[PDB]
Design a protein around this nucleic acid. Structure first.
Lengths: 223, 132, 101, 165, 359, 335, 35
RNA sequence: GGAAGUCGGCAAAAU
RNA sequence: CCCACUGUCCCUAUCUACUAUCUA
RNA sequence: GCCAAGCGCGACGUUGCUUCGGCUCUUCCUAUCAUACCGAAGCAGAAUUCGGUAAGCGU
RNA sequence: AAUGCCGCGGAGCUAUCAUCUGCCGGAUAACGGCUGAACGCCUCUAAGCCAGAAUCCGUGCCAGAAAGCGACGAU
RNA sequence: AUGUGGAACGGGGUAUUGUAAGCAGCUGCUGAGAUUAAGCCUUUGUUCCCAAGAUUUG
């Protein structure tokens, strides 16, 4: 668990997206965040400082796994070309034309199993299964449609809102085939995905994340 | 808030009834004053997309009414020109009921979200459904 | 840089030109001019509107996968674009001659 | 921090390198500063320096001297409460007078029992107008005796009188 | 009390000059005899009211700045009473409040009298009379301002203790090594001197152990300092860390330290007690060699356990052009096979067709 | 009201914007020019990549309105020497070229047609007969004068303007010694100086001209104005067919929008594209000058690479850049 | 904020004339001069 | 946007 | 008081006739 | 009242006790609310307080 | 059909309802100093000299003396 | 005061409106027709016009 803050915001997941094979950082902001990300994963996986839709919300807008990545239909042709050029050839990049362009805020996906929003389109689910090569389950996290924003998913563990029931948490953990912990990050910030991004071997949390929250994340992720 | 915001066409002045887009149960939002207004003579303060102003819950639940408390405008009826050159106008004037720190009071947002507003407020982008 | 197609006239829409409109269904309508923007406003069906491409199409009158950059591929695509347009122009001229006949 | 923290800072780090010299230079040049001040300044602040410097010389001269021996129709004046043709304002009316004893030399706030005689006018005496030189009787049980008002209540705002004793 | 946040308290002479100068600079100061009697009366009343408002505002700010002894925490109130004679401070605050009430009453009486003013001289005399009475009242309350200023300086310099959280109180014989252990454990560096009662006032330092925040509070050797230490230890949810000089190198015998600990046991009751055998090389018994600086960490961990049981790209950019002036190029960070192709641009749209979207 | 620095608000006493200040001379810099004369044609809108570090649109594209000024090459017809005096600058003497085109000769006459065309006749005669007087005058300028201004006139015939009188003016020759300026003027006698040689599309210049009149208001309009910091985006060549074709766009086209510039015509010579608006309506002459004081912030220093230039029909709601692609999309017409 | 006549701002303008200006403009004039 | 104008829905549009 | 409405207002802009202007 | 340098007063000190009324507008003054720069203060930092220059610019 | 009514409507006008641009030098005040007497020491001051405010004076910008002027062309 | 001269029209480009009259069996001729400088652009198109009156000036 590494503590970093993009600009003056503790929601690192909004401004950046983390996968098990590549990393994305915002463009036009401060290079310190990109340097911090490269200091921990630059020598392991490629890091691309790009933007989607001309905004710094690429972290909550782009969702994908180590196999493939998805970008909203609002992404520019030049932006898509830059992403493909920067990303490795084995990392497939596909555009999704969905009514909810916030792929990262609607769907949380791991390397093997993915949970999508209840109102996801059939074509989008088919594209996600074809690209990410993962099983897609249409469910909800803590009773909220924004499963991708209210829940953090990884290969070794998952984080959900602490208000969820024990039976609901157990059912979600069994469905995800991984341990699940119902807690909060960044000192009570209920958006776990926005407040923290976890890869297969490393995790990045906001500068306002408490020591107890960091220890809980380390225990859950076994990193 | 976080980051700068460009000059924008102002179309939501004071004394405006404005739709509530969150799931908190509020229906109508009433503009009282606009934050960050200059000392301009005989000029009514106005709001635009991504701007946070003092708003009152007119229609909603009893507990959220009668509180002069901030609200961020997410949709604007009047057409504006973004710096990329395209012109945008939305059907209605939607807003989100927000604490003065800048954190979404509700848990879900209905309707499209302006890209400048999602960029400006990271919490809004986190709780946004679609940003087009 | 994408030159989009207007919803109503189906003509080319260039940056700066026209107006952009977003629906509550998150569907986006681009209008090539104020006339076509207004024509959407009272909800005239393009296919009934005489001068729209949709009318001229349905009346007998007429890549989401990114690709790695390659100089040879771009040159081949640019060279083939002119030939394709020339072939399309010839086919349209023959179709116009057939329609006149 | 805790308690005298720059006193901890002065102890463990030291003082400013040239503070002792700068404070010495400031003291040495103060005489030129004050003389310059006495000539350039003007207005209220100059008059304050004038009064302050005159006082300082007076005490300084004494301290040296102590050194060597060691070696409409209404009443417009304050009053005390047909015949009442005029109007006596309640605010202008006063009921307690500060009477200073002559032999004792102590000022006591005694109630105004009544007005003996006003030399300005018998009508003012009848109306009980408190003016300069007016004779007024006040209770002296805690010390009734008469007293002459040696002040102007309409201007001073207080009924300051001296006991007739 | 410990919050400080109180503005400096000026002297009586300085306060009077500040009040008069503020009234003169703010209110108008041009009133000729040509104006009407009502205008003259209004001008005098405005000046008197402005002076009264300025005096009342400063007095109210001074009164509000000083915290109430009753509303403070029992530990804070006891320390303030032991250190600054809280009874005297309360008397001074009451005297200032009474003086402020008298000033307001005098101003109200003068305003009423001047409301029926007669001429310019009467208004001028009335205006002077009110100002002099206010100045006399301000000058009379002289020693109270000095006492309040000293209390404010002491309160601002005082530490902001937090007895609510987990804390470790180190008290005992003077220079028994408890201060040295506290200085080593916490970030704060408490001064140690050969003279007795070197740490006259309490020193509080935060420490981290087992993902927990512990407030290490040192106490004077056991007098005003001893009384303050006893008062702080009386009302504080903390673990006692009494240190006994095993080698008697601190000038206090082992029997004397034991007797002092037994006497102070009434304050140490209902708390985790630690008996630190100091200078071992030279109530849980823990041996900590003060001379050898050995066992301090173990003692701190034992006390904490007992208390718990009881309860680069950036560098390149800065070197090249610095932030905000250096243009980061994403073309270099591309996986294109041909370096020339990666560095060269391509036509996005040509002849009305998007070449990128059609290739 | 407005600023008091612009009153008295009265009509400008000149149709052509006169330079009131030239950049300070430097002997270290070699001999060059500082000002140029052009004609306003109109503006279009362009899409340009934003390489603005620290900005929120860094590495993005924006749409900018950019004024197009036709600047046909200017002909140097003479030189003027200025001597510093305790009463200011004074024109010591003037030397003209032997042969002057009818465009600049038309300036000296109100009625050139009715005139006997007698301008510079004896001057040309004495120039051809004896060159000692010309040598004496040029030696006088290089020896005594400290400021040198070359008389240059615009080739108004190439511009699609009915006016045939050339706007003669002076360009201060900043750089080198006084002798160097004199030698430069003599070599450039009767020749043409090109805007490509003067400005180079990435510097920060000022444009000066007379605003358009709004009639009578409760006088308002037709005043001399000076716009500062107007950035050149492209100095396009008239002969080249790629002038309006960028590198990201191809699509061989000309800067003149399809349907022609409104009330001006078609641009055929070298043109200059300046960001933002400039004073004066179409077909009015504008003057360009260099930066008097050096100030290149990031906006004034960053390089610019255009991506797409609009050439739609500004007359009406134009919707096609060129008639070629218009015919490709639109069905074949009856003609 | 300080105005454009701020003495320090004029000093910093003078400092930056020889840092991000001057030389790159002089040779820029030279290039179109030899043209 | 909708009375925020003015002491004020005065006049208009709404019906 | 609620709802609706509108250039009363933010903040004015455009058009038309007459007036206004000059000539005998 | 007590002193009281001094020239019977007697300064500074000391004892008591307590019809008018307001919108717009134009400029102007500084006796400065903000902006700029300094000085001092237990002024760590931050946020202040007091005091100078200062009417350029707002209010 | 007094411009009967309705939709669109160029051109023009227009909109912080649209878009561009808004500059540099010294001299000072407060104040901080340097050298330095007066006054064998000392002293930012007396003679002298630096640093220094959104202040001042210029530059830049607008007007051009309609009784200020120069160079030049023709006659 | 005879010329890449000017003006009248005309053609072309470009624009606005929305498929004209008329013919045939809503469809086709028909994105045709109409308007297009009155402060749009262009013209190897047609015709016409001008190589003057008056005034003042060393």
């Amino acid at each position: 668990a590494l503590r970093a803050q993009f600009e003056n915001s503790n929601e690192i997941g909004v401004f950046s997206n983390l996968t098990n094979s590549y990393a994305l950082v915002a463009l036009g902001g401060s290079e310190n965040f990109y340097s911090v990300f490269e200091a921990e994963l630059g020598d392991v996986v490629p890091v691309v400082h790009t933007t989607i839709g001309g905004t710094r919300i690429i972290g909550r807008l782009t969702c994908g796994n180590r196999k493939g990545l998805l970008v909203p239909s609002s992404t520019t042709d030049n932006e898509l070309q830059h992403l493909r050029n920067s990303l490795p050839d084995p990392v497939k990049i596909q555009r999704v034309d969905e009514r909810l362009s916030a792929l990262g805020n609607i769907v949380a996906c791991n390397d093997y199993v993915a949970l999508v929003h209840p109102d996801i389109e059939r074509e989008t689910e088919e594209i996600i299964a074809d690209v990410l090569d993962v099983e897609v389950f249409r469910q909800t996290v803590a009773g909220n449609v924004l499963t991708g924003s209210y829940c953090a998913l990884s290969n070794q563990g998952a984080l959900v809102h602490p208000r969820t029931s024990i039976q609901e948490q157990d059912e979600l953990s069994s469905l995800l085939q991984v341990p699940l912990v119902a807690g909060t990050i960044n000192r009570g910030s209920d958006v776990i995905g926005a407040g923290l991004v976890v890869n297969d071997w490393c995790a990045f949390a906001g500068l306002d994340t408490t020591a107890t929250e960091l220890a809980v994340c380390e225990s859950i992720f076994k990193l | 808030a976080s980051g700068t915001k460009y000059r924008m066409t102002l179309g939501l002045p004071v004394q405006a009834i404005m739709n509530c887009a969150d799931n908190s149960g509020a229906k109508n939002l009433y503009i009282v004053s606009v934050f960050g207004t200059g000392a301009r003579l005989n000029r009514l303060p106005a709001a635009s997309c991504g701007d946070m102003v003092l708003a009152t819950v007119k229609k909603g639940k009893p507990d959220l009414r009668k509180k002069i408390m901030p609200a961020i405008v997410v949709r604007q009826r009047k057409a504006w020109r973004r710096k990329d050159g395209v012109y945008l106008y939305f059907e209605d004037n939607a807003g989100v009921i927000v604490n003065p720190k800048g954190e979404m009071k509700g848990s879900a947002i209905t309707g499209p979200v302006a890209k400048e507003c999602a960029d400006l407020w990271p919490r809004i982008a986190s709780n946004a459904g679609t940003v087009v | 840089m994408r030159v989009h197609t207007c919803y109503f006239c189906s003509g080319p829409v260039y940056p700066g030109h026209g107006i952009m409109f977003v629906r509550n269904d998150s569907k986006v309508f681009r209008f090539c001019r104020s006339k076509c923007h207004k024509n959407f406003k009272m909800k005239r069906n393009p296919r009934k509107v005489a001068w729209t491409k949709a009318y001229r199409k349905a009346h007998g009158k007429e890549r989401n996968v990114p690709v790695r950059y390659d100089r040879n591929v771009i040159a081949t695509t640019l060279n083939a674009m002119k030939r394709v347009s020339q072939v399309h122009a010839k086919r349209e001229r023959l179709f116009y001659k057939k329609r006149l006949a | 921090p805790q308690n005298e923290y720059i006193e901890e800072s002065i102890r463990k780090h030291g003082r400013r390198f040239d503070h002792e010299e700068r404070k010495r230079k400031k003291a040495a040049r103060e005489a030129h500063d004050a003389s310059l001040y006495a000539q350039k300044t003007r207005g209220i602040k100059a008059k304050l320096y004038q009064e302050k410097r005159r006082k300082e010389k007076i005490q300084m001269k004494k301290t040296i001297k102590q050194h060597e021996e060691r070696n409409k129709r209404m009443i417009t004046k304050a009053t005390f409460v047909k015949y009442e043709r005029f109007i006596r304002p309640m605010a202008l009316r006063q009921k307690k007078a500060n009477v200073t004893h002559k032999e004792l030399g102590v000022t006591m706030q005694l109630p105004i029992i009544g007005v003996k005689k006003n030399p300005q006018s018998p009508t003012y005496t009848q109306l009980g107008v408190l003016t300069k030189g007016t004779v007024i009787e006040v209770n002296v049980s805690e010390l009734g005796k008469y007293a002459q008002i040696t002040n102007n209540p309409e201007l001073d705002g207080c009924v300051n009188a001296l006991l007739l004793t | 009390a410990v919050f400080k946040n109180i503005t400096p308290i000026p002297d009586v002479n300085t306060f009077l000059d500040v009040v008069l100068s503020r009234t003169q600079r703010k209110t108008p100061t041009v009133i000729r005899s040509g104006f009407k009697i009502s205008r003259i009366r209004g001008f005098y009343g405005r000046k008197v009211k402005f002076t009264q408002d300025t005096i009342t505002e400063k007095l109210d700010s001074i009164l509000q700045e000083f915290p109430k002894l009753n509303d403070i925490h029992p530990f804070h109130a006891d320390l303030l009473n032991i250190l600054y004679d809280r009874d005297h401070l309360k008397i001074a605050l009451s005297q200032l409040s009474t003086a402020k009430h008298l000033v307001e009453n005098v101003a109200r009486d003068y305003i009423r009298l001047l409301k029926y003013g007669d001429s310019l001289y009467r208004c001028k005399q009335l205006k002077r009379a009110a100002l002099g009475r206010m100045a006399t009242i301000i000058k009379r309350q002289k020693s109270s301002l000095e006492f309040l200023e000293q209390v404010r300086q002491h309160l601002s310099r005082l530490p902001a203790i937090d007895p609510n959280t987990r804390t470790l109180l180190v008290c005992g014989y003077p220079n028994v090594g408890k201060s040295s252990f506290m200085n080593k454990v916490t970030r704060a560096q408490v001064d140690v001197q050969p003279y007795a009662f070197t740490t006259k006032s309490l020193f509080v330092g935060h420490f981290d152990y087992k993902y927990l925040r512990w407030q290490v509070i040192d106490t004077p050797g056991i007098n005003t300092i001893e009384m303050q230490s006893i008062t702080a230890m009386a009302h504080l949810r903390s673990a006692v860390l009494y240190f006994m000089d095993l080698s008697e190198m601190c000038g206090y015998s082992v029997a004397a330290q034991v007797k002092l600990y037994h006497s102070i046991k009434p304050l140490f009751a209902n708390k985790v007690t630690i008996l630190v055998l100091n200078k071992i090389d030279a109530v849980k018994v823990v041996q900590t060699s003060c001379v050898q600086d050995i066992g301090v960490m173990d003692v701190r961990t034992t006390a904490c356990e007992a208390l718990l049981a009881a309860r680069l790209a950036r560098d390149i950019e800065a070197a090249n052009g610095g932030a905000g002036v250096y243009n980061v190029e994403l073309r270099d960070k591309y996986i294109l096979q041909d370096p020339s192709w990666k560095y060269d641009r391509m036509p996005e749209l040509l002849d009305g067709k998007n070449v990128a979207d059609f290739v | 009201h407005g600023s008091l620095g612009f009153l008295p608000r009265k009509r400008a006493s000149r149709q052509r914007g006169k330079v009131k200040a030239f950049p300070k001379d430097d002997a270290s810099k070699p001999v060059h020019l500082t000002a140029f004369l052009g004609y306003k044609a109109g503006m279009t809108h362009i899409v340009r990549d934003l390489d603005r570090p620290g900005s929120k649109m860094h590495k993005r594209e924006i749409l900018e309105a950019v004024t197009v000024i036709e600047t046909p090459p200017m002909v140097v017809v003479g030189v003027v020497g200025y001597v510093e005096t305790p009463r200011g600058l004074r024109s010591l003497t003037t030397v003209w070229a032997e042969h002057l085109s009818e465009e600049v000769k038309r300036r000296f006459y109100k009625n050139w047609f009715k005139s006997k065309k007698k301008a510079f006749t004896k001057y040309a005669k004495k120039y051809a007969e004896s060159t000692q007087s010309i040598n004496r005058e040029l030696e006088r300028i290089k020896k005594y004068c400290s400021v040198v201004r070359v008389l240059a006139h615009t080739q108004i015939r190439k511009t699609p303007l009915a006016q045939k009188k050339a706007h003669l003016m002076e360009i201060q020759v900043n750089g080198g010694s006084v002798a160097d300026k004199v030698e430069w003027a003599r070599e450039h006698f009767e020749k043409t100086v090109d805007i490509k040689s003067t400005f180079e599309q990435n510097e920060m210049i000022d444009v000066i001209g007379v605003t358009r009149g709004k009639g009578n208001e409760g006088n308002a309009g037709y005043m001399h104005r000076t716009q500062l910091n107007s950035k050149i985006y492209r100095i396009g060549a008239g002969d080249d067919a790629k002038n309006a074709s960028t590198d990201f766009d191809a699509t061989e086209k000309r800067i003149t929008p399809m349907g022609g510039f409104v009330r001006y015509g078609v641009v055929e010579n070298d043109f200059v594209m300046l960001n933002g608006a400039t004073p004066g309506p179409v077909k009015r002459v504008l003057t360009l000058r260099k930066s008097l004081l050096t100030h290149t912030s990031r906006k004034a220093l960053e390089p610019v690479s255009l991506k797409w230039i609009d050439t739609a029909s500004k007359f009406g709601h134009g919707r096609f850049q060129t008639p070629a692609e218009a015919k490709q999309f639109l069905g074949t017409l009856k003609k | 904020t300080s105005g454009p006549r701020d003495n320090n701002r004029n000093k910093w303008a003078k400092k930056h004339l020889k840092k991000g200006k001057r030389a790159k403009n002089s040779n820029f004039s030279k290039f179109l001069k030899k043209k």
